């Protein structure tokens, strides 16, 4: 009987949410008007008003006097991820403990920090300084994620996943933390016109535990019931990520929307299945609001009604595309918000990172 | 439930680079007096590299500056074939079906990109579309044992699944050699290398063969006031580490309290273990761990030697030690206890427990 070992019967729940972004508001409008003051400058206007974005927010005011020389240098990477350092640290430990304010648990029982980014990058970084700040313990376990795209988030949660449910009494927190302004260069291809365009700054933080499923969790708990990964066969150059020497950039390919199309509908449907539903049962769909063309393209595979892509929207075009926080913010509002009126609303959420690369979940939320 | 580590295998770029002739090439570069002496002090004798950074090609690419992304182009370049050869030859010896890998770790440093290694991996060996992907970026010579620990929990949620760990670590295509002291040191200690395990989870009950290695327990502890100790960041031409004066002394009192309760709490004693994985991070990385634990000089053997045939080469050293562990018994005893650890930023001991089965 040398059989695997039964498995761990609980279920990943999200007990804490958290969400917050840098204060300083850039209206998308004002934003075109001061890019497109950097021949023919026609092609800003342009790109910009075709973004759905009409507010974001920003860590560091590339644009600003200050900022703009540094801006134009060339071998400023280690500055930035100073800079990086130096905007995060306050953000991620303010909603860090937001996340954990509702909580009764101690810091003892908190045996887990996730932290994701892919527009950071340095030594002793924002990890460290979140479980000083928190007084968390000094034994606690930590996993950087690096690069993982605007899906992060995804790879994020289920390191947590599994940790609590192989620890039952212990929690994990999840953070996200993106700061693109501090990586803002403005140059003229149209993919950098482009990227500068809907990027924002954000920060997100979860609290994970493990629940048994007899167990009746209260309204507002977020049950992670499944998660899914599909490498879209012959996609690689759909997103990709590297570093400059004056900062980190993404590149995204004409044919990402057209990746989405052809494999949403399908990794939907197979995961959908696996648990005995259809597109046509779920209640919530937490798009990642990556941009228009993202978000346009992700309903269209699954055929659902633009309607029910209300919240990713909404995300979108009050902060932008923050990357893998953009998923948790979308999320939030599910939580504070139903979308109908039976107790328990089921949703999927997914999201795009390199390789492309669909990352995401089925999940539950206890409405009463 | 077990965590078992059932496959495990290195490699290495083909070139070798003996420290005695890097002296001499390097030190061509007022006061080079200076680094004859580093060298000697390193206690290498060779160590393998991706590229040769003081090549024609290269001298000139490296002396530039804004060279990043070429470098990390560099890195995939080379980290790739190495990687995937080091993962077959993981699996190699197990009679897994790709459908039974389930989570694939990559831990790095020394280079950033995507799609990157793990994808390259996927791919290359044929493993499931679906399989989960976590990449562990700077977490320096330490980040085996965070890989190792989000295997564990994997291969324990889900027992019927088994988890693949990758490291690689490729300093030579970061090589600079600038002004500072520091840089000096850095370039006279890492190596190039990756390293590869396979984990699975066990029946508490279950007989285990030779060769296999239970992971007892994990732990970490952050040093209070050690922040500056180890430093990564990435510059306009290369990635860099900045270890500081103070650090051989952090680890000269960190290791011993932290190893200590860890041991307590599993009912051990120093006195009790028989093998000791220190990280070959360099010579007084080895030389005050040994001294912070009051063991033998000799119980550092596995660590020395590694450092001295391939330098530094972060986060995999600590795998080349424990498969020295692996291939060759300490003693006559069925069942050797050791314990592992290296030293991660913010300044952060991280290691475990565990058990090589020999009869």
Redesign the interface.
Known sequence: ????????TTVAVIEGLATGTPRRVVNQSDAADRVAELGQRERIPRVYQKSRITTRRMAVDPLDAKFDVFRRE?????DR?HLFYEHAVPLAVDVSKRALAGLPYRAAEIGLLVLAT?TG?????V??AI??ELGLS????????????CAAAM?AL??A???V???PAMKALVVCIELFSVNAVFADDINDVVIHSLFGDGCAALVIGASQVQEKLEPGKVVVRS?????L?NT?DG????????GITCELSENLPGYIFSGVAPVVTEMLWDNGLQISDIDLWAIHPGGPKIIEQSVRSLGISAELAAQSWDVLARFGNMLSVSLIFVLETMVQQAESAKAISTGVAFAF???V?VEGMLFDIIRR
């Open positions: 009987a040398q059989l695997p070992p039964a498995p761990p060339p071998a400023t990477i280690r991820m892919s990058f340095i030594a002793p970084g990890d460290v479980v000083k000094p034994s606690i376990s930590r996993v950087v994620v690096n690069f993982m795209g790879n289920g390191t996943t599994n940790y449910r192989a620890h998660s899914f990964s599909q490498l066969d690689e997103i990709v990520l590297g570093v400059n020497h004056n990172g390199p390789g690369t």
